[PDB]
Subunit: 261 residues, 4 copies
Amino acid sequence: MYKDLEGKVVVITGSSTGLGKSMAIRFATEKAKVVVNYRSKEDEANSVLEEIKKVGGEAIAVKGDVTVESDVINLVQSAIKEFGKLDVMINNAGLENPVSSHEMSLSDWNKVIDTNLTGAFLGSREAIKYFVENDIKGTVINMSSVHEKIPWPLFVHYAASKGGMKLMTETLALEYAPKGIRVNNIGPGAINTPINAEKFADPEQRADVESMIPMGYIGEPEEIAAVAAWLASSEASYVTGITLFADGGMTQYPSFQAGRG
Amino acid sequence: MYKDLEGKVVVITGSSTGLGKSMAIRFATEKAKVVVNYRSKEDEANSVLEEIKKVGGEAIAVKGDVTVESDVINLVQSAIKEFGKLDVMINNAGLENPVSSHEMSLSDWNKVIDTNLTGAFLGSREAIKYFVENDIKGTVINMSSVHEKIPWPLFVHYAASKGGMKLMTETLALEYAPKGIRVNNIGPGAINTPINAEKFADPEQRADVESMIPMGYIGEPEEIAAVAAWLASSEASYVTGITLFADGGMTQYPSFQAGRG
Amino acid sequence: MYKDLEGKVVVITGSSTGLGKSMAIRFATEKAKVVVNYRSKEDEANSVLEEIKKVGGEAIAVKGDVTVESDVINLVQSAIKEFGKLDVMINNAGLENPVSSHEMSLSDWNKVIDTNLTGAFLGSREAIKYFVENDIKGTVINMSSVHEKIPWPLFVHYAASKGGMKLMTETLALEYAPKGIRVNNIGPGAINTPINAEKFADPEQRADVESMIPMGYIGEPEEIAAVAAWLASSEASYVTGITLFADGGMTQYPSFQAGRG
Amino acid sequence: MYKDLEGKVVVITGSSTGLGKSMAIRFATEKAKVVVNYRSKEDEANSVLEEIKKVGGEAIAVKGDVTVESDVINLVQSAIKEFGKLDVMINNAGLENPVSSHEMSLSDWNKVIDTNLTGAFLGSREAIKYFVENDIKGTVINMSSVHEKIPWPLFVHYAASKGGMKLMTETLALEYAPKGIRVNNIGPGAINTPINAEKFADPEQRADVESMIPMGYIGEPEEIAAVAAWLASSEASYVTGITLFADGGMTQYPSFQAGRG
Ligand SMILES: NC(=O)c1ccc[n+]([C@@H]2O[C@H](COP(=O)([O-])OP(=O)(O)OC[C@H]3O[C@@H](n4cnc5c(N)ncnc54)[C@H](O)[C@@H]3O)[C@@H](O)[C@H]2O)c1
Ligand SMILES: NC(=O)c1ccc[n+]([C@@H]2O[C@H](COP(=O)([O-])OP(=O)(O)OC[C@H]3O[C@@H](n4cnc5c(N)ncnc54)[C@H](O)[C@@H]3O)[C@@H](O)[C@H]2O)c1
Ligand SMILES: NC(=O)c1ccc[n+]([C@@H]2O[C@H](COP(=O)([O-])OP(=O)(O)OC[C@H]3O[C@@H](n4cnc5c(N)ncnc54)[C@H](O)[C@@H]3O)[C@@H](O)[C@H]2O)c1
Ligand SMILES: NC(=O)c1ccc[n+]([C@@H]2O[C@H](COP(=O)([O-])OP(=O)(O)OC[C@H]3O[C@@H](n4cnc5c(N)ncnc54)[C@H](O)[C@@H]3O)[C@@H](O)[C@H]2O)c1
């Protein structure tokens, strides 16, 4: 679809599953060279690699924990060593777990902040460092959430990590705009991925979530991958520092439908 | 680029010049059927029609003042009568003029509110009325500005009209999301159109405006048309109620670069 | 409570009932001179005047329709003629009525825009014109709503009017900040006033509204008057261009409590 | 000024200097019992205690590093042990240092995130835990910055920490609103404190900062202390989850004055 993406090198953290996997496949279809990332073992990663080979794409899988600085540095270097350059960096890895805020341990808080926020900072830092030192007008796409805007009781660490990601992205966008480096956030609403498999399995829970989505349906990973592909393309040449919400209307305050209140 | 746009009927208000004209041409290139709109000068409209024919597109030009209710109703009906349906409604007509707020006449205030806000309401109302009565999952795209967010001294009427447009769009998006009707805003920064021809002609003024754009350059109409084409496509299927800013970073507070303050 | 408010002249539009009335009484208690405003007959206004005399306050009632320019001009002039000066201008008059957006008449749309937005513009314009011509560091307080942020299906005209008010206020705040003139918005959530008397009378409707308020209760007019008094005082000397929401948490997305979604 | 503050117990982190010190003195003047906090330099703390005694206030100083969990727990317990209860928790400690984002070390990033964000989380957690276990309708006030909204090149860690604080506060506000616990942010612009002493000492830098403030002057600590006192009082009974910016108009985009762009 986007001719300019052909030959571009794209690195996606946490891309052996869910949204990351869908984006890896979409970029492969756009003929971009993809660097898949897995945390522990390559099993889940090989699934994505075969999907990419199937569409005739080219990709490699690199092990790396985004909370480990040397791993993030190596991830970026691996892309350059294998494909000779880096064009798009997508910080997608993340985690979440529910706990009443006043009962949340420092350990749980740190795990989410370290992975969701600091991990994205490290990925952004390394990609931009490369872009700046080589005069490349690259782009960084950070995977946020409707929760960088919508508060989330029981997930205060997650909400804080994404609210932080928003300001990080806007700051990097302003700071490097003069160099032609674009930095944007994608803000997905409720999407059908493994992180919500069990939750959406229960008919009562699914109905509950769907009631919070004005469009009435839980989005598919491909609908988010579509956003990532467009933002990475030259079609979005004048777009930087924004958060593009793809949430079926979730951020529009679903409780106020029918003129309530 | 977007196969799903082929055959779609697109109506664009104030499309004989500037952004409207660029969008008309872009949609024609996507093989959509376009309805161009001119307020009074038909010669300008014929010009756009010629450009559309140059790309093998199909279009018609319809006279209509967006501040006249019957004109807006006729504009929508003309599209349906000529092409048999309506798929995308783009409210783009607008005007602006500088006046210190405490010296602004009610006349000037009303002219801008009537055209920029009420005109968009009428266009949105008529398109949605049609979508609802015919079970069509159409889309409405409203042309806003970075000024639905960035205050604008000397243009208080313009700022108010776009701030109003933002809430109008979000309200319509929430209200009609259940019917599959998407409503979104495009928020352009400084773009090279006739509305800024004289301003950008002066080297001192151009440099002044460019200093307020982090990316360092005034955008081209095609960069905005690209956003409109994507939002109208099925690629943005899960996107509604947002304002997609294409401003080279203007909304990121340009005065704070280099860690100032 | 606020010693600096003693002797200050405060004009409040639509102050014969509801929030306007409560603010008039609160300012009278702060020993400010108040100018009450009624649209048709002085009956409702005399009630407020007696309440003010009761607390030992000084006030006058002036007839005026905020949609009539000459009436707004006269309202401001009346304050200056009676008390010799003007210190605080509060644009509070407003109206609302429910109608599906695609079925809303231009007449209904205009009535709400004219009263809620244009009326506030006229009041702000006249007060600021006076402040500027007499080097007075006055303040303008505009009564908004949680709906300058929260979309409102069935009330698209109201939402648009307040979204517009937000940008109007921010623009005026920026434009006149150098002159020491502060302009701020107050954003009330659901408050117990006559505009909601019937709605809250029904036990089913009240429970419905309360379910949308995190704090669990519908606010009282005095809780909003408290905000107006503080914003007008020198305690808020460095505060301008903001919208101070007093909504019991309504803007925090009530549907997401208990970690839903 | 606020009669309801008499006898209330207020804990303020990092209150031996700057804004913290000013708030400690203001609350003492309101007859509240204050718990001052110092990280290491006790002499600075004794200084604030002397100022408090000068106004006839009652206070104690407690050593504590907000990045050390046991220190935060002890800080809250010390207030309860000394004064028998806790009513207001103010997380004010913070730090910042400039570094180009692509050159920022993980160490610098973590120091700011740990202090500015995690420290505030710990303080909020401990105060709320106490409020919940004892059915106290207490309040938490978190000291943010205009930079929870305005991006800040060279201070990406600071911006991220405050953007995170915003979502943390909104989440806690929503989560505990049913229990009557209010949580709000104060967002100061440029204020005359020791953190900016050297910067404002230079006439060129001061003029530069003042040019970014619409009101034209750098605020005084007392202007922020005024906001904290009001938010803690019952006058703000229906206010929760907001960020009250006291910035002289900084968040209104100063570069757009005079209708530029
Ligand atoms: N699924 C949704 O509905 C939804 C909504 C909003 C935001 N998001 C965000 O989108 C991203 C993708 O979510 P998803 O649904 O695909 O979830 P997911 O759990 O399937 O994907 C996240 C991936 O991150 C990896 N990961 C976690 N910690 C890591 C670490 N330290 N180092 C390396 N990899 C690590 C996981 O192994 C996993 O493959 C996340 O950042 C998530 O917060 C998802
Ligand atoms: N050019 C920019 O930099 C910029 C930035 C932000 C927003 N915008 C918005 O984008 C839209 C397009 O602006 P543009 O630069 O192409 O300006 P433009 O003046 O070239 O286009 C506006 C069109 O609106 C038409 N129009 C005005 N009043 C009308 C009425 N009552 N009925 C019918 N048509 C009417 C005009 O004849 C004109 O062709 C406007 O809404 C503008 O506010 C433009
Ligand atoms: N009550 C709430 O819950 C709530 C929530 C958000 C916002 N508001 C806003 O607060 C303001 C006060 O609302 P309220 O509850 O007291 O309602 P209200 O109806 O009691 O007060 C509004 C007043 O405006 C007057 N008015 C209307 N049109 C006028 C005109 N053209 N000229 C002069 N006066 C006119 C009315 O006569 C009335 O006294 C309104 O702007 C409203 O939109 C109220
Ligand atoms: N001064 C401003 O213009 C301005 C503008 C926006 C926000 N703020 C914020 O307001 C707060 C007050 O700033 P300020 O100007 O008074 O600065 P300051 O440096 O004078 O005050 C911060 C205090 O935090 C203490 N502190 C730092 N790390 C600590 C730790 N780990 N444990 C305990 N105490 C610690 C410091 O010793 C100091 O007394 C900060 O959070 C700052 O980010 C200040």
